[PDB]
Design an enzyme around this catalytic site. Structure first.
Site, mmCIF file in Angstrom:
data_model
loop_
_atom_site.group_PDB
_atom_site.id
_atom_site.type_symbol
_atom_site.label_atom_id
_atom_site.label_comp_id
_atom_site.label_asym_id
_atom_site.label_seq_id
_atom_site.Cartn_x
_atom_site.Cartn_y
_atom_site.Cartn_z
ATOM 1 N N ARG A 75 49.575 37.141 48.920
ATOM 2 C CA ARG A 75 49.712 38.632 48.953
ATOM 3 C C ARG A 75 49.025 39.153 50.215
ATOM 4 O O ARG A 75 47.636 39.619 49.402
ATOM 5 C CB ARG A 75 50.889 39.354 48.180
ATOM 6 C CG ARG A 75 50.983 40.737 47.817
ATOM 7 C CD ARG A 75 50.996 41.731 47.332
ATOM 8 N NE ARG A 75 51.632 42.673 48.226
ATOM 9 C CZ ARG A 75 51.033 44.447 47.672
ATOM 10 N NH1 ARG A 75 50.656 43.824 46.190
ATOM 11 N NH2 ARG A 75 51.791 45.391 48.357
ATOM 12 N N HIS A 119 50.104 48.674 54.407
ATOM 13 C CA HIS A 119 49.660 49.182 52.967
ATOM 14 C C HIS A 119 48.993 49.388 53.617
ATOM 15 O O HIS A 119 47.179 49.733 53.202
ATOM 16 C CB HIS A 119 48.825 47.163 52.325
ATOM 17 C CG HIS A 119 47.998 47.511 51.096
ATOM 18 N ND1 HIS A 119 48.506 46.512 49.983
ATOM 19 C CD2 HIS A 119 47.537 48.302 49.832
ATOM 20 C CE1 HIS A 119 48.218 47.666 48.828
ATOM 21 N NE2 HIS A 119 47.214 47.790 49.431
ATOM 22 N N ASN A 291 53.952 47.183 40.907
ATOM 23 C CA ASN A 291 52.441 46.841 40.504
ATOM 24 C C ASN A 291 52.527 47.172 39.085
ATOM 25 O O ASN A 291 52.714 48.824 38.947
ATOM 26 C CB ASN A 291 51.157 48.014 41.374
ATOM 27 C CG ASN A 291 51.843 47.246 42.772
ATOM 28 O OD1 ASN A 291 52.116 45.994 42.883
ATOM 29 N ND2 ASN A 291 50.931 47.965 43.782
ATOM 30 N N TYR A 293 49.466 48.169 36.135
ATOM 31 C CA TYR A 293 47.664 48.874 36.053
ATOM 32 C C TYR A 293 47.387 49.871 34.618
ATOM 33 O O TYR A 293 45.790 49.118 33.999
ATOM 34 C CB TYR A 293 46.709 49.575 36.851
ATOM 35 C CG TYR A 293 46.437 48.577 37.999
ATOM 36 C CD1 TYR A 293 47.776 48.742 39.120
ATOM 37 C CD2 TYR A 293 45.510 47.850 38.412
ATOM 38 C CE1 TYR A 293 47.758 48.626 40.202
ATOM 39 C CE2 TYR A 293 45.297 46.930 39.418
ATOM 40 C CZ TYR A 293 46.582 47.347 40.720
ATOM 41 O OH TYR A 293 46.387 46.535 42.003
HETATM 42 C C1 LIG Z 1 46.491 58.283 37.665
HETATM 43 C C2 LIG Z 1 45.161 57.225 36.962
HETATM 44 C C3 LIG Z 1 45.089 55.708 36.946
HETATM 45 C C4 LIG Z 1 45.589 55.509 38.646
HETATM 46 C C5 LIG Z 1 45.957 54.288 38.420
HETATM 47 C C6 LIG Z 1 47.261 53.411 39.484
HETATM 48 C C7 LIG Z 1 46.076 52.746 40.118
HETATM 49 C C8 LIG Z 1 46.437 51.736 40.413
HETATM 50 N N1 LIG Z 1 46.488 51.305 41.527
HETATM 51 C C9 LIG Z 1 45.679 49.950 41.650
HETATM 52 O O1 LIG Z 1 44.630 49.856 41.768
HETATM 53 C C10 LIG Z 1 43.744 49.102 42.550
HETATM 54 C C11 LIG Z 1 44.441 48.935 43.686
HETATM 55 C C12 LIG Z 1 43.800 49.718 45.713
HETATM 56 O O2 LIG Z 1 43.304 48.302 45.277
HETATM 57 C C13 LIG Z 1 45.326 48.851 45.660
HETATM 58 O O3 LIG Z 1 45.526 48.738 47.129
HETATM 59 C C14 LIG Z 1 46.635 49.443 45.773
HETATM 60 O O4 LIG Z 1 47.922 48.744 46.255
HETATM 61 C C15 LIG Z 1 47.440 49.522 44.342
HETATM 62 O O5 LIG Z 1 47.125 51.118 44.472
HETATM 63 N N2 LIG Z 1 46.068 49.829 43.340
#
Ligand SMILES: CCCCCCCC/N=C1\OC[C@@H]2[C@@H](O)[C@H](O)[C@@H](O)[C@H](O)N12
Ligand SMILES: CCCCCCCC/N=C1\OC[C@@H]2[C@@H](O)[C@H](O)[C@@H](O)[C@H](O)N12
Lengths: 443, 443
Positions: A75, A119, A291, A293
Site C-alpha cells: 500500500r 494521503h 487503521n 494502533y
Molecule cells: C490520540 C493519541 C493516539 C493517536 C494514535 C492514532 C495515530 C495512529 N496513526 C498513525 O500512526 C502512525 C501513522 C502515520 O505514519 C500514517 O501516515 C497515518 O496514516 C496514521 O495516522 N498513522
C-alpha cells in the site's frame, strides 16, 4: 497455530510525503506538507520531508526488500502535486513516469499494489483556494482521481480514495497540528463534509474508468473504553466511537446521514443543507480499510470540549506514549461488521514506534515491535473466526520515515533507515513478518 | 503648554467585532472571528464577540458619550459580512441601515467619521475559498469597498482600507494566534501581497466613486532598539523595522518593491512574479495611519526564526507586559516622514490596558492610563514641531472591548464597560482626554 484464509493478503504500507523526499523534483508542485514543514515551529526538530528516505531515488531497492521478504501487497500513496503541479489542469508526465515504474515493478514481482489516492499532501495551489474548506474540491479531487485511473488503472486494481479523513479534517483544521495548520471548528466540519463529497465523486468516476477494480476508503480508529460504569462515561465512549472512528463517515456512506451524537455536538458547524449532498455520498464502495494502533480510557468531563476527556492508564505503551491494547483491533473489526456489514474489510495500517537501535552485530533487534504485531495479528485472526470478512492486513510501515509533526524521531518501520547514509537494515520484525507471510499465519 | 495645530483632529477608535455583539443579527453572515472565537482553545476564557459591548443596540448612547466628551472624530470599522453575508453578491440592507444611522448621528452631532473598511472580520464564506491566500480577494475586496463608497461616500469622506495588514497576514496566518488561525509561512506572505493588491484596488475604486474624499491605510509599528552596538544587533533592528513597521507596505506603495531586507528573508515565500503587481500597488494614497503602543529591545539571535529575538527591559509596562516607550511615537512619526514623506499622517491608535478598578465612588481612577496617553501626546506634539504633517490622533479605545485572543480580560477603554449590565463608566482618562480636546493640547 492461527492459520489465515487462503489467499489472505499480507502487506506493508507507506505514504508519499513520508518516504519519498525530492518534493519539487521533475517539476512537481509544492504540497501543503512542504509549506507546513518549512514553517518554523510546526514539526519537531524542524524536520521536513525534503529528503526523508530518499525513496524518490531508492524505490527499486525498497521494492526489492518487499520481494525478498515475500510480502504479498504494497500500500503506497501518490503525491497529487507530482501529478498536477497546479492541482488541476496540466498533467506532469514525469510524475506519471515515477509511479508507473513503481507499479510496473511491483507487478513484475507479483506484489499487489494498493494505491492511496490521497494521503495528506494536497497541492499548495489548491490550499490557496481554500483546500478541503472549498466545496469545489469535490471537482478537483475528481479530476485528479480520473487522471490516476486512466493512467494506472489498467494495472492497479485496488484503490483507496482517502487516508483517514477524520485526521485530515480535525487534526489539520481544528487542532492545527497537521497541514494546513488551521484552528477553526466550522472549517473542520466543512472539511469532513467535502472529504465525503470528494470521495463519492472519485468512486463514481472509478466505475466509469477502471475495469475489474475495487475501491475503498481508510479510517483511523481507537478502542475507547469507559472510565467507569456511570451512564455518562458509557455515553462518552459512544460519542468518541461515533466521532473518532469509522461511523463519522460510514453512517453517511451506508445510511445517508452523520451519526446521532455527532449531529448533537456538531450540527451547528456543518453546512446548512449538508443533507442535500447525502444521496451522492452513498455511492457504493467495495471495501472499508481500518487503521488501528491504540486503546483509550475515556470519561465524561463537563468542562471539556465535547464533554469528554481521556484518562491515562498504566498499560504498556509505545514510544509515542500510545497504550497497547491488541483486543481493540478485534473489537473494531467485529463492530464494523455489526454496524455497517461492509462486503470486505482490510486492516490498512497497524504498527508501532519504538526506540530502535543498531546493535554491534549490525542487526536491529526490535522484539517489542514483534510482540506488538503478533498480538494484533492474533486478534485479527479471532475476528475472522467470528465471520468478519477481513481480506488482508498491512503493517505500518515498510520503512522508518517522516512521522508528520513528530519528524524522524519516531520509527515505525520493519526496516530501519540510517538517515545519515540512507542504508536500509531489515529489522528482526521484518524477518519475523516474512515468516508470518510464509506460513500464512502465526505458529 | 503644548498646543496643537489649528484644526487638529482628536478622535477615539473602535472596531466592529470588538464592540458590536449580535454578529448574526438581521441577516449577517458569519465572520472568521465568529468561527475562530467559537473554536475551543483560541481565545482566553472561551470569550467570543457574541455580545461584547452590545454596541449593535447601544450605538446611540456610545455616540452620545463621544459627543459629551467633546471628541471630534470617531474611527470605527464596518463588518463586511453584515453588508455582504456571502462576501460578494447580495447586499444586506439591514447591514447598510445599521451603519447609516451611526453615520447620520455622528454628522448631526458634528463628529467626523473615519471608516475602517477592514478590521479583521472577513466573511467566513470567503475564508472557505482561501480568504487572503486567494489572489481573487483583490476583486472581492474591491467590490465590497464599492458598495461602501456608493452607500456612504456622500457623507463619509475619510476612509481606511485595511487595519494592520501585517497583523492580518502574520498573526492570522503564520502565528495562528488570530483568525483564521493558520501556521503556514507561504500562505502568510501570499496574504501580505494580496492585502497590498486589495488595498490598491480599493483606492482605485475610491477615485471613481468618492471624488472629494481621502483614503489611506493603517499600519502597526513598534520602536525597535538594538541590544548592543554589535553590528548584527544593528542589522537586526533594521530588519525588524522593515518587516514589522510601515516599510513592509509603504516601500511597495511608494517605491514599487518590498524592502531589501524583507526580500532577502522572504523571497522564497512570495509569489515568484509578485513584482508584476507593484505598478498597480503604487496607486496614490491620501494619508498614512500609524498605530503605536510599544517599544522593543532586539538582538541578533542565531537560534530564532528570522534570527532575531526580543530582549526584556527594566521599563514601565502596561498590564499587557508591553514596554512603555513614549519617545517611540516621536521616532515612528519622524521616521515615516524621513523615509516616505507621506502628505498627511494620523496616529490611528494609541492606548494602554491597565488593571482597571471601579472604586466605591462609582469611578475609575486610571492615572496609569492618563500618564501613558499624556506622554505619547507630548511626543506626538514634538514630532509636529519638527515638521511631521500629523493631522489627528485617535485613542484606542473609546470602550473596553473584546481584545481578540485575550478576550475581555484586557481593558483599553477610556470608558469602562461593566459587561454584566452593559453600564458605561467614563474613566478618569476619559475626562482628562476631554480636557485635552477642549484645550487642543496639554496644559
Ligand atoms: C490520540 C493519541 C493516539 C493517536 C494514535 C492514532 C495515530 C495512529 N496513526 C498513525 O500512526 C502512525 C501513522 C502515520 O505514519 C500514517 O501516515 C497515518 O496514516 C496514521 O495516522 N498513522
Ligand atoms: C511582541 C509584540 C508585543 C507588542 C504587541 C503590541 C500590539 C498593539 N496593538 C493593539 O493593541 C490593542 C489593539 C487592538 O484592540 C486593535 O483592534 C488593533 O488594531 C491593534 O493591533 N491593537
Amino acid at each position: 497455530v492461527k492459520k489465515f484464509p487462503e489467499g489472505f493478503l499480507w502487506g506493508v504500507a507507506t505514504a508519499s510525503y513520508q518516504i519519498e523526499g525530492s518534493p519539487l523534483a521533475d517539476g512537481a508542485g509544492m504540497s501543503i506538507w512542504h509549506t507546513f514543514s518549512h514553517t518554523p515551529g510546526n514539526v519537531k526538530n524542524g524536520d521536513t520531508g525534503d529528503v526523508a528516505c530518499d525513496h524518490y531515488n531508492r524505490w527499486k531497492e525498497d521494492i526489492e526488500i518487499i520481494e525478498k521478504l515475500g510480502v504479498k501487497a504494497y500500500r503506497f500513496s501518490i503525491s497529487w502535486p507530482r501529478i498536477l503541479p497546479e492541482g488541476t489542469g496540466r498533467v506532469n508526465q514525469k510524475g506519471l513516469d515515477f509511479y508507473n515504474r513503481i507499479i510496473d515493478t511491483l507487478l513484475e514481482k507479483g506484489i499487489t499494489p494498493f494505491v492511496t489516492i490521497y494521503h495528506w499532501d494536497l497541492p499548495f495551489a489548491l490550499q490557496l483556494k481554500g483546500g478541503w474548506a472549498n466545496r469545489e474540491i469535490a471537482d478537483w479531487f475528481a479530476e485528479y482521481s480520473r487522471v490516476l485511473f486512466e493512467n494506472f488503472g489498467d494495472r492497479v486494481k485496488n484503490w483507496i480514495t482517502l487516508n483517514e479523513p477524520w485526521v485530515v479534517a480535525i487534526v489539520g483544521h481544528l487542532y492545527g497540528v497537521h497541514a494546513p495548520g488551521m484552528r477553526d471548528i466550522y472549517v473542520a466540519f466543512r472539511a469532513v463534509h467535502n472529504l465525503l463529497r470528494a470521495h463519492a465523486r472519485a468512486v463514481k468516476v472509478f466505475r466509469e474508468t477502471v475495469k475489474d477494480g475495487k475501491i475503498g476508503i481508510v479510517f483511523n480508529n481507537g478502542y475507547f473504553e469507559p472510565a467507569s460504569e456511570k451512564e455518562e462515561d458509557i455515553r462518552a465512549v459512544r460519542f468518541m466511537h461515533q466521532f473518532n472512528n469509522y461511523p463519522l463517515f460510514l453512517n453517511p456512506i451506508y445510511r445517508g446521514d452523520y451519526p446521532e451524537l455527532v449531529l448533537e455536538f456538531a450540527r451547528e458547524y456543518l453546512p446548512e443543507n449538508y443533507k442535500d449532498d447525502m444521496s451522492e455520498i452513498q455511492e457504493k464502495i467495495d471495501f472499508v480499510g481500518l487503521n488501528y494502533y491504540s486503546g483509550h480510557l475515556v470519561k465524561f468531563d463537563p468542562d471539556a470540549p465535547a464533554k469528554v476527556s481521556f484518562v491515562e492508564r498504566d498499560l504498556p505503551k509505545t514510544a509515542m506514549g500510545w497504550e497497547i491494547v491488541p483486543e481493540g483491533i478485534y473489537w473494531i473489526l467485529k463492530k464494523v461488521k455489526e454496524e455497517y456489514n461492509p462486503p470486505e474489510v482490510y486492516i490498512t495500517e497497524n504498527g508501532a514506534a519504538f526506540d530502535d537501535v543498531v546493535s554491534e552485530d549490525g542487526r536491529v533487534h526490535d522484539q517489542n515491535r514483534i510482540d506488538y504485531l503478533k498480538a494484533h495479528i492474533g486478534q485479527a485472526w479471532k475476528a475472522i473466526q467470528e465471520g468478519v470478512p477481513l481480506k488482508g492486513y498491512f503493517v505500518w510501515s515498510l520503512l522508518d520515515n517522516f512521522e508528520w509533526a513528530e519528524g524522524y524521531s519516531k520509527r515505525f518501520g520493519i526496516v530501519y533507515v540510517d538517515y545519515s547514509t540512507q542504508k536500509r537494515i531489515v529489522k528482526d520484525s521484518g524477518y519475523w513478518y516474512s515468516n508470518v507471510v510464509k506460513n500464512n499465519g502465526l505458529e
